[model samples]
Target chain A: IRRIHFVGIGGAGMCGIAEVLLNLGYEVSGSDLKASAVTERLEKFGAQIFIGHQAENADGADVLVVSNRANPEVASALERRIPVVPRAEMLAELMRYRHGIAVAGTHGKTTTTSLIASVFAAGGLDPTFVIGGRLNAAGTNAQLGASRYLVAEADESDASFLHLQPMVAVVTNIDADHMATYGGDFNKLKKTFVEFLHNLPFYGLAVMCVDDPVVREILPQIARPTVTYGLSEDADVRAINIRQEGMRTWFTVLRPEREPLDVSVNMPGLHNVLNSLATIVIATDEGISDEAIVQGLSGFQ
Target chain B: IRRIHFVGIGGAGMCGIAEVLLNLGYEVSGSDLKASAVTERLEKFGAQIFIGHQAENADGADVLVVSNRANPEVASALERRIPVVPRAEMLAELMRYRHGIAVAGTHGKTTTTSLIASVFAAGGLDPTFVIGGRLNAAGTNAQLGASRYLVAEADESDASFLHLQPMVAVVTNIDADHMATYGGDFNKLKKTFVEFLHNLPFYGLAVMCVDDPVVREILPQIARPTVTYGLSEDADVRAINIRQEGMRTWFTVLRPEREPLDVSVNMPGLHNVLNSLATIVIATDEGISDEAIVQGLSGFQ
Candidate 1:
């Protein structure tokens, strides 16, 4: 059996994959600086958990998966010629065999990704989801579902998302937050997004929000089957009659060849609506159903 | 060029189908003993609204749909040799050409039908629904949709649901409240429910709630491809680990051959969970994603 070990196993990002791998029946071991509720829960589920990182923690690990930060575990694994992989690389590997849906944004990816996952689950497509933060409803950030569908956030922070090859790509917006990753070039940032969309097969879909100026600027560069959504009149999927009653926002979505969809999200502001629209576009294209979209977005807290 | 008139049009059941027929572009007219908000709204939508029932009101009508109680209008339509159909027969006619999902229960049919509608909408099915009471979220109980799916309540109170020949049927529970409708015989009521299931084609599905003892007794009698959901261990789709926090109820659903699903509904009650489970069974059989089921149930008010 293949053995997988995690360094800093108690991490939000690391724990989820560790749990999934353990559930996947791999011989799993992990080391953390200190034990946490997360690690204890993993131990309850049969993970070999260790406290305080030591060289011996890497002794039996055939391969070590590390967080953004790790130390003696890596050095020991390297000396032993054991393969060491980044968290995202392992994530990419997990997604490789599934119908991967990658949601990327300078912001709003976590919410958008969770929304998509919620909608998929409501539709009874139990998707394997790896999200940035805990999707509170699911109680974990990452889970291994029985279905071949995998949904995860594609991080552009370190240009690590380039490692991901998703069948469907969503770009909520582009911003200057992670300029360091693109050599401080805004054009590079925009170009990288286009690169992500191009990663999809020619027949694959690219869902983008035309409300963002940068997203609109890059639309022409996307050669894949692209669907645009936003408040803009030119978008293929558009939201109209948007109104907010305190925390709830209601809007009618107009999709090509479909009746206007009247839906409400539990969130306020147009950004959440855009996120919901992105989800609607993907779900619709997947032939999910209107009822699932309406319930998923409205039920999302 | 077909004209349809409603006698007592402002009644809950009459208004929805009337609205749908109006939206379908048929020349629609209605007469009620007294005018209210419903009539005014229908008038605004171009219905020829008459405040009082008159024999003349049925003039030029190809058909007249009447409420449980009607007056001279029915008398007038019959005299003119025009078709005068009961409300349920009209509902059946509306469902005939579509993929019909008729929800029948002595108690929970309305809520259950609405929940299924919500889930269907979330899945992007855009199902045309004719329901009792306003669905609240969708603003109207009945509306025309682009898809061939039609979801409506199947009433057993007067054995009227026998008129509906649905592709899929749901029985939330059979109670004795409608016993008078079956000549005060409980077995006849039970037999009628089984007859409803038989209405489905050989390939059609029957989603029943096994939590109700009456439903359990009727299980083997159902000859259709049946799926059962309840809190019972024997149910094909079962709810376990049920807990309620104020107005919210959380439960893990054990579906056949699928991973356990953790879900929560905004309402507090075992009944509501059963209602949601019935919705899940139908949605799953229809190949809706799990995300839509989760969202639709939780989002339903």
Candidate 2:
């Protein structure tokens, strides 16, 4: 669509995608509670800027972008038969034509996703990235890439991660949050992850950590070619040597039938290491150079 | 195997892989024409260094490595049933359980392959790599990695590149150099690339430049997922907005659904940009951050 309108243009997930769409030359218009640098940046990028959420603001728009159609104006637009697409749906449409690498889980989504983007950028593959939180490296939460590769900080807190049919899906770990959306069903949360991975094409790859009991349990159910990374010996892509000091986590990443890499990330905690390992799997499989890995992770701060 | 012997070990392809294997903790032993610093470096890495090719070097060796099965010592190893593998065969074995990206073309393979590895390293994925030439960025032609991704300068000068069954294969361009190997037929040489791409798994990807008519013509024959780049508008990944300054090429890459990124490579000339584009495609698809792309390519000099 040439012109897209957003209901809550300032939301984390919605804003990043909006910025990326604006870069793709689509006319973007959105309203938020108050004006921020994000909307200002969007406006500077040639998006048709608006200040408030109203049905009139959605005028002449091809599609209504929203986090959730939770507004009277949205309802009015829907009654008018305007196609109100979830931010995730638009994300999926963007992903449909690009090589999407999605970072997803209950936690560590933003940092790991940022790490993936940081690494991709450091390695010289200018990528379009849509992050849920501020990526300090870029000083902005969102930016459009020039390649068909889109690295997204995916969210299970919402229903849209399922809508993103990424070529490579990196699920960090599953946990107990976002349960209300699952109707308090842990099984539903677990089953939804499997379904999310299934959204990938037939030849797609899954980069997930099997250390989580839920992820481990769902391993057999995933039909795609999977790269499992973690502290487990059984993991296809494993991280063995882990040492932490201050904010940096150092580890030797091991893979099947190859030498392990000595690496250190500027972030601390096992969760961060696990997150880094998922990035490691994607980078290596995608044919990245090793030196970039060290420089980016070591200098991540 | 603990003890790996090499016949004609000083050859361009044989030496780099040997150096990397030595780093991987293999007890490498090889007999070459003369003792150069390359051989000396191998010795320092714990290889059983020798000068001059002789049948005796094959003694007590578990397997013999050779550029081809043409050597007399290789034939002697075969008589004793000591498995004689081509340089590419051992490379394939190393790639058997890892992610392999092989760059194959009649020309510019070394620079392009090195560019891919360079970009990957800059982007933050520690990958193991072997190059036909010394990669100026790494200062060495070969490196052992902690990750399972292997990037190599595939040589169709022999039967090697065709033997590599990589997860992602990059064909920079196809031409008529290796004609005698294809029975003096250019079509056979061209068809060999199709065969080379076919070596990739169904889930594998083919990153090729459609600017070359030979590569453009056989695009439909490739069954795997393909990412095509070139000046052509029909290309999936297009390079536009090219501006060349002294010793540097600046261009904006246009992808299918993402925003364009301003990219600059230190190397001048459109060919270098083409080579760099091959790396950009894989780095983006494999999930690198955008910043690394800029950080790596600009710093490539």
Candidate 3:
């Protein structure tokens, strides 16, 4: 079996994914500064554990994956012509084999997608989800699920998210900030959303919150079965009868041919409501149940 | 062709469903007090729309579907043994051939499940959904989708929502304040939730919030697989970094594997966040996309 080695195998992000790669039946080896429960767990899961980093730890390994702060041992391996990739690139490799739902944003990206991943797991779709934050619902951000869905946030800077093509892409509010690499123009950001929506095969859906005037203004411009959501009066999916308590908010949503549902969120605010909207819009469409939606969002932190 | 008849079908709860049945290629006929756009739309869709209530509307009909306020025409169909079922009972039939997600709650049921239905549709999985209020997203309360998923709500008012046998069920929150039904013995109310949770076929999931002490306390007793969301230490999904704007709140969620996600909502406060939590739970578990969740929540009315 081909072996993949990690410089720091005990990291929250690195270890979990390494475990998955190990479960993929690849021989895995890694080194960490100290022995912790995480590294110990990896060792039990069949990863070759080392007490400290060394050039030989990477020997016989075909690929080495590192975080942003790679160690000198990784450089030594790099000079030896062993391909070394960032953590995200490996994440991209994971998505290459499954259906992807890339949630990209400058803020709240992980929170938004965690809710999505939580419900996906709850409903038994069992997606191989790779989340950015702590996936408290399943107790792991990265999972080797059985379902074909892969819900995650795609970091937009340096256009890294663009490497993997997703079946669907939900764009939160397009920030005027963080477009330096793409000419930093407002139009570029707007068109960027349009471009991302097109990444899915022609059989794709574009979900957006028209509550934002910018999104609403561009609504008529690209009308390929766009799914519109918002608290605005004219949105396709809308919420009313809102009652709140600090970080917990409750609202009744009005929709077609069913009783109105009273929904809750772990976080408070209207903007996050839009984020959750994108999740439900995609989920309920995928044959998921309401109970799963509740469990996913209310516990998402 | 099977002919399904409706008694007093023009009412808000009955009309949209009649439209769906008509579109399902069934020979549908409904009677109302006077002619309005609802009836006109049904007529446009080839429904046998009657201007006034009469026993003849039920003549030769296969079944009589009624709201809580069933009329003499419904009685006529019942005496004929054409099979008379409540609107909810008939709603169950609609779900019999499809995968269903039912959202039932007291405070914000409409908005909660509406967000689910709206988001599910937004992602292109189009469901045969029905809701009590105007589905502001679709501008009507019912739809005929080509997919197998069905997103809907369970109304607690008068116990009308109890007939559903869904693959998933969501019970939002049980308050300590109310004691009107069965003299307010909180135990009975809590047990009722347990009863509903057991309706699924062994593998079904239940979604609820742990933010409420009552939900948290009784959570351990649920028979089916349960998923929890909250700000509590032990919650399955958790949220933090919460901030509220004008009817718009931005926050972050910490899940097991994902990083902290920045999210926003169109409505402010802790209650709506919980509401969207339910939506996200169901959506994410159903293999939905992250962007669709954002779209479903942000633009919900």
Candidate 4:
């Protein structure tokens, strides 16, 4: 059995990774400076817990999972002895099991993740999922099932998502939120996203949101097979008659290839339309019958 | 088909209920002050969305689902023409289909709801769940399934949960909040809980924390089948050899009739032990075989 050690495992992302490892029957252990309710639940799941960080925690582990806060020096040095992987790498590795759909952008990662997870679960795909926020429907950060499809939140803060190999990589919108890390240049950030686009295999698809000028501008440079979704009519998957009422939203999902699907999301704000399109495209591409897709979308809570 | 209408349907709770109904094949429609993403999605799912809360919005509806914010003056008046049910009452009616596990108390209701939902899902129970907070696991507030088990969060404020008939109720701990509504007396607030306890069917079970003096004192008077979980050995479900490491917690779950289960939860803080024990008791009692329970606990993310 593999023993997995996590660094900075208290954050939602790191804890979610640790939880996945624990679920897979690995001997999982982790360390973080402070305690939280999430960590307590992880411990109850049979993970060895280390409150304070130390080199000893990394010793003798079969694999090391590092969070965003992991010191590169510590992790890299440990890699010489044991295989060390970043959280993003772990997510990418997990994605290899299925049609990996990565939802990316500066905003609405959590909300989008919730929508996709809800839709897929309703569709009966029994998908494995790792979202950024609490999905009142699914009730946790990661869901492991026997399906060959994985839905995940792709973070662009460090351009770390470039490490992932996605069958469908969705760019909700590209902005300069982490410009400092990308050399304080908008062009550099765009270049990094382009690199993400290049990483997709020949059969892979890129789902881009064309509403943002930056993302729309970069669409021409990427040679990968692409599916565009947004408010714009020119996009492959476009929303029409969009309206939001309190915490609920009503819209029509229009695709040039097929009949326009009526869209209703139980989440608030216009941001979720991007997420809905991602689900529609991914579900349709996965060979999930249209009836199942409609059933899934209609049943999303 | 049952026609359901929601008042203040954009609110989180109302939206969740609306989604559940829509998924259940109800002819659902609702009105709110403004259109939101959730309403838009609901509309996509075939729920007619009305942008404003006019009396006409409630027209031709078989039942009205009112949010907590709906004033009695408005709801009671509407009940004259049609049956108007409070959100909690609708939830109670929904709970009738399954084993209703209600997580009540001031704090940790959301967390407990998430945990129990995860346990049930991981255990393959496919329970219908309604939790107050976004669970990173299930992406929405409510998840509807065919299983005859309903897991929900029970709010103690307004003594609203007194309406629910739970097969098993988990009271994490009672505190002195909502004093204004409870007559500004601790005894009165405690009495509200007593009423909640008294409402349970004779065969129902009450899962409580023994650490709190208030709950401890009130336990015996309820006179129903009850189980206590706490750090104390006297409790029915006890956590022994508790250990906290940085942000994680490890403990041994000791029960009166079975082998002590060694549980390691990734969440931090001492407060979670109470929550974990409560989950263990409910899971074991629900006929979830010990192997599945252990696997579920171990798989908790």
The alpha-carbon deviation from the true structure for residue B3 of candidate 4, after best TM-score superposition, in angstroms, is: 2.6
Off by over 4 Å in 2: A7-15, A30-43, A50-56, A66-76, A86-93, A133-143, A244-247, B1-301
Q: Which ten residues in a row have the lowest lDDT in candidate 3 chain A?
A: A133-142
Error of 2 at B273 (Å): 56
List residue ranges in candidate 3 displaced over 4 A: A1-301, B68-72, B127-129, B133-147, B176-184, B245-247
- DockQ result, candidate 2: 0.01
lDDT of 3 at A94: 61
Regions more than 4 Å wrong, model 4: A1-301, B23-25, B32-37, B40-46, B51-55, B68-80, B86-89, B133-146, B290-295, B298-301
Docking class of 3: incorrect
After TM-score superposition, the amount by which residue B169's alpha carbon in candidate 2 deviates from its true location, in angstroms, is 54
Better of 2 and 4 by lDDT: 2
Each prediction's DockQ? 0.01, 0.01, 0.01, 0.01
Summarize candidate 1's per-residue lDDT along B156-192 as a digit string, tens digits: 8744678787899988877655555666455667889
Share of native interface contacts present in candidate 4 = 0.00
Model 2: per-residue lDDT, tens digit, A162-197? 788788888887764554566644456678899999
User: Which prediction has more favorable TM-score, 1 or 2?
Assistant: 1
Write candidate 3's Cα lDDT for A46-80 as tens digits: 88999877777778888888773357678777888
DockQ for the candidate 1 complex?
0.01
CA lDDT of every candidate: 0.79, 0.74, 0.68, 0.70
Error of 3 at B87 (Å): 2.7
